[model samples]
Target: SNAKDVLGLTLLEKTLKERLNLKDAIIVSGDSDQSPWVKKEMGRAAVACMKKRFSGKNIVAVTGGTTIEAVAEMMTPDSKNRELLFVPARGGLGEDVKNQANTICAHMAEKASGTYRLLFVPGQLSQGAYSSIIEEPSVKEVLNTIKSASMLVHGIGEAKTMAQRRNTPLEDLKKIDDNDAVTEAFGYYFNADGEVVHKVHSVGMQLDDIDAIPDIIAVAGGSSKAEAIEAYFKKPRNTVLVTDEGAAKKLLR
Candidate 1:
């Protein structure tokens, strides 16, 4: 019932690579859901991937959540002294200030001894304000940086739970449930077949934009997220997945 308490993790990774059509998979020992420290293990795995993927100068884009916050917490100064510039993958994801993309971007940059840019948009936007804000010089500058990012790191979660966490509007929540949304990442929600069921109207990296990023890593774990993880990769995003065994065994089983 626990990832660390079992074996065949390599087999699990192999299956997921082909099944999810992933670039790679790094499955740590435990289910983060059951043991919180497993989140840090995934974070470390993700950081190892980051260091390998980054070059002399890098622009890294990341989505924020408790999971990626663990990644940020695990970051250390780059060994090769790479010049790192971190940016949020999108504007606010209805996450609190602590786990907001802006916060994690800064934290990651600081820990890595680099710099960062932040995009400040509210959890909700008026159409009128959104139009003007997207064109503003500062926001647009960071937005442009996001588009050119060399690497992207993000988190995935169950659709219903995330919608609830973000306090999604009742009418829209109905649409997600009705469409059979199973997973959410980078403000977009998807169903069992990996089709986008809904997307939060935000001011940064759209789902399609992920294709342009050279190195992509999706980091999330816990047995509770097995279905969410399986649903997400039903389509090829061409990314590495850093997860834990709890989710791995549950997903394979």
Candidate 2:
């Protein structure tokens, strides 16, 4: 059974890489939503993937979510010698304490014996406030580090689920639904065709900045996330997807 699983995963990885235009794709066995262990495995896989790109000092920008939280949970001391600086990709996204990017980055820094910088600001801010906040000396320093990040690790989520998770306003929620947004990432919502349907106000790395980042890795899974995953990769931006068998199989179908 183990041998068969490996073969299946190999084929799945190849197919996903080709279909999704991914730089690389790793698919582990089992459904993450059905088994907690599977999610941890995906997290471990994500950490391993990031380690391969480690060399000297590198700023890694991470976003908030359970999958990314799991990634932080699996961080080890293997890369302790490397100068890795973890920073939140953006300000708070209205997630719980445990799943917030600030919390996750600190956990990763602690586990890996690295350094981290937190973004202390509202998840959703007004356009005027965003403009003024970016001019702050402290905020500018972190934003500079975040924008110059060499590696970015983030999660993909169903648009509606993420909106609700953040307790988004009813008007914004209605806009998301009216636009038929399917995926959410980095505070932006995209439809099935990978079109940006909506964007939330926050200060940090904008979606346009993704093209400048060298290593962009997305960690997400669960059979139910197949559509969200696919939607996110509709127009791949040199991303590496770390997922599981449940999402891989469902995505292929």
Candidate 3:
């Protein structure tokens, strides 16, 4: 019942091309899943981008997840401190591989030769707790910067599965399922009908943030997540979806 997972890089690249209309995109992944596609898109740019080719100040958003962390590992530091800004789409509570929010941002900064920001906030939270955390200066600054993010890349989650991870009551999950909630992201719950079932109280971004961002890239995989991914797309504004072959091949007509 996890919410988000890493998607294959090749499919992700294609998805970005098709969905985001990226004339050229810099993927902030750390794994080989995207090696093939990374080779295709940033071959020399990868080296240059890593070496700090583009001007710093480019806006990039990344979510924390295993696949993205893998992509981060592979990133080269040729682009160090180039004036790029990376933001975490969610908190970095997951394992190393699954915690790509800050990790990927750091990696991207190193590769693109820029600096980055981390939200340090969880995606799920109760309203009261969420409000209190937002009061922190550091957390508030990061959240504010991310709200104006130009490009956002994040992971999607399965509603039922994510509920379990976030410890949503079994009864609440039932209500979520009954309402057809299938996707979970950035603390917000969505049904198969793209309805907002419930929201988690975390330190950072909300669904409204998703709507605010100009470019939002969603990454995920496995057919198990297809419904969740689909639901996420239906709800978010300006979202660019990326998924693995396994899930893409399984999505229904």
Candidate 4:
């Protein structure tokens, strides 16, 4: 590539890679906000990046959202015929049936001729319920697999919108708003400094787990997502971000 490729996506990609201190940053052509297909292009790009990181045997963790769903839809069988296990990174971030991580991971695994394990944490957990649920043998088993994930694919969104999407309890919503939270990922809402503002109760992969994973991908786009993306990456994280021109140009602008 020259100083910048045609529309300069290559340059934009380099800029964001350094800006976010990412393992890599891939950008699609159009804005996902105005053009829906652009989001799918991000999916294809993410999927390609993921395949490159695949190892002989792997456990891949994923989160739920329209963006991550696009990733699931783009999945295909791995050419290497490697052993693959897909699992939800964590449980209980509200999304429709199809967008749920449990659902999306199943679809991704199936498409790759791999196996999957779903976390069955309660949609809304009481302290008592949370204790007993994780103690269940099957739940504990899946938690181990999720923690063992070699890779993780997730999405980030503005905290307020994510809380609204998940139908966050009024009490927690107030806490998130009071804290000036800006981004949400894996049921955790974070402030502009990437500090946890509010956390949803669940058992599986935690934020710290990202540090242990060998590979990680975050799929999200749209100009509207620029704030959340910037805030989320404010703290150093080892992640590859597959995004679009909308968020890209807006982020650099």
Candidate 5:
């Protein structure tokens, strides 16, 4: 592990293995680093507890990223639970298919023989804009269904990098950094100090909404994301994290 890669994934896997007894789960990631672990967990769950529940109904959620795309390719539809219903956690807004949340869901659904749903709104929204969007009867209906999500598949990001990727400004970035922020996702900015620096306007799911969900799968990597991942873990009590060797190795400090 040249830069703390393998270390983070190992800890993430270990933490989930100990903390949660997930049934049929989906890794919302595209990282090849987790391929082995994904297969292992799916196999174990199928034989153990996941297979027998709800007529073998295991809804696996996944998001799109280079890493998640990779994970999607490795999955095989379960014979018993061939009813994979891949749901996007948020909207793609204007991102490309490679980065679209729905795109990832489609791929995973194809692999798992599941159903898929796409959220067509923008990923980020202002309070006014969000309220307006919410007012739409169609939007409200979809949101209600999405909120009832039994599980969320997501990709975690270092606050700064993700903000930049989302096209946030430098001043906002500095504000987050000054607050010791490490991780950003799902409209929340958690710092290394375990404080919420600046929370984003709700896009689709709120933090509390996510909290209510039964399962959360986070996929992120690179030692750069160590502090961010750790901070998010501190805030959320029940998270199933999936990362690569880089983040696992580098984030110990």
Candidate 6:
């Protein structure tokens, strides 16, 4: 059975799917903010969606966050022997070691029994470094893998929360606050209206590259993130959203 059938979230799922023009919306019970298990459930839900959509050899690009870490924790080995390659969706974002995409990607690969490629570039690259790093044969090889990823899975964060988490520079933090940014995803910050207010200059998975990838799954939850989630979906790139009832109910409100 699908999430709706198992979680009794039929109405919530249908309402959000139609409202966001999404291919699918899976809402689990409980608030992640109130209970840690809720986030794990959301993670499990995300993996389920991935498995359901799985086909031949595929590349999966993922981002970093506690939610995405849960995705890694809950992933199980794929029954089919399809070649699965996992890669970090972007360069490091200065997050804690446990929450960085590279760390999560490796763990996910281990759990899924898939191979993984890591991007060795620094999280914040200077213009000179950015220019030359992509030229290195090693960097270019992984860059190519990231760009060719068929599926992208990521998390959405509150703008200020993410800025603090990354220890953003004072000037950039001011710009994000000044622009009234509400949400962050794929290294880009968006305003309440869903306009890109600012972006972190990093290699891999630029926002412009999202449309081409066939499967895009966003995993996030917690009632407090309702506005952030709504703001991100205002520009709707994700085909599937795996969230919890807390955020789902708040969004409907």
Cα lDDT tens digits, model 5, 20-119, are 3322122222223445454333323222322233244444445555445555655566666545566666553322312366677788677766777666
> What does the lDDT read for residue 87 in candidate 2?
96
Clashes of each: 0, 0, 36, 0, 20, 0
Query: What digit string (tens of lDDT, one per residue) describes model 3 on residues 74-112?
Result: 555432344557777666332222444677678756765
**Tens digits of per-residue lDDT for model 1, 24-87:** 9989987888899999999999999999999888999999889999999999998799889999
**lDDT for position 235 in model 4:** 87
Report the candidate with higher lDDT, 1 versus 4.
Answer: 1
lDDT of 2 by residue, 28-130 (tens): 8889989989989999999999999886788999998889999999988753487889999987443232337888889988888889999875555456776
Residue 208, model 1: lDDT of 85
Q: Judged by lDDT against the true structure, how good is candidate 5?
A: 0.56
Top candidate on TM-score is 4
In angstroms, how far off is 198's CA in candidate 2? 0.6
Q: Quote each prediction's TM-score.
A: 0.93, 0.92, 0.64, 0.94, 0.68, 0.93
lDDT of 6 by residue, 29-100 (tens): 999999989999999999999998877989999998899999999999999777899999998443232337
RMSD of candidate 5 to the truth, in angstroms, is: 6.7
Of 3 and 5, which scores higher on TM-score? 5
- Candidate 4 yields a Cα-based lDDT of 0.87
Candidate 4 lDDT, 55-170, residue by residue in tens: 99999999988898899899999998889999998876332323389888998888888999887735544667778778789889998998899999999999988888775677
lDDT of model number 2 = 0.87
Per-residue error at 108 for model 5, in Å?
2.0
